[PDB]
Amino acid sequence: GNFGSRTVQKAAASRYIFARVSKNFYNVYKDTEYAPVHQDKEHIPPAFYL
Amino acid sequence: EAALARKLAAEKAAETKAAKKASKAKVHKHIKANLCGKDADTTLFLTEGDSAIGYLIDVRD
DNA sequence: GCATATATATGTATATGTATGTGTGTATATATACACATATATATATATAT
DNA sequence: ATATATATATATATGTGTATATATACACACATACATATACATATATATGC
C-alpha cells in the first residue's frame, strides 16, 4: 500500500493497507514457545519474546 | 456597548500589507509547480483523497 | 590660534531569561461536507369580487 | 381593495457511501529563538581651556 516517504509523515488510514510478517522477524526472532508467560492469566501474550 | 463598538473600531482599522489577492498561496494541500503561472506545459493533477498525497511530490516533474 | 579632555551616545556583542515549543506518538472522544428521490408541507402569492 | 381559497416548491429525512478533520496530557532537557537590553568602550568634537 501507500506508506509515505521521507517527505510525508502522516500514514494513511487502515482502509487501503495490507500487512504481513517480514522475514527479518524470522531472522532475529526464533524459538518463541520458550517465552516467559505473563503473570496475568488473560495476558495471552507472554512477558516478552526471544 | 460603546466600549465593544470602540474595540471594533480599534482593531478593525489596523495592520499593513493590504494586498489581498492570495491570502494563502494556492492551497496547503496543493503542489505548486516551479514553472506554474508562466508559459510552459505546466500540468495540474486533480487527485481524489489527501491520503493519495504520498509519492505525488517524489516522481512528478 | 591651537591643545585637549572628557562625556555621553550609540554600536555591539554577548549572556538572560524567557517563550514556544513540538517533539513523537499514544490515548481519549467528537465534528465536518457532498451525490443518489419521493413524500409530504407550508406558506405565502395572486385573483376576484362586491 | 384586500380576505381568503388554494396550489406548489421550498425543508428534512431516511440509508448508503466517501471522504475529511480536531482539542487535549503526557515531559524532558534541550532547540531554536525572541528579542532585548544593557552596560561599557571609544570617538569626536566642540567647546572649553589657554
Swiss-Prot record, chain A:
Question: Which residues does the Swiss-Prot or TrEMBL record annotate as the active site?
Answer: 16
This protein's source sits in the domain of life called Viruses
By sequence similarity, the record places it as follows: Belongs to the type II topoisomerase family.
User: What does the subunit section of this Swiss-Prot or TrEMBL entry state?
Assistant: Part of the DNA topoisomerase complex made of gp39, gp52 and gp60.
State what this protein does. Answer: Medium subunit of the DNA topoisomerase that untwists superhelical DNA. Controls topological states of double-stranded DNA by transient breakage and subsequent rejoining of DNA strands.
Q: What is this protein called?
A: DNA topoisomerase medium subunit
- Organism encoding this protein: Enterobacteria phage T4
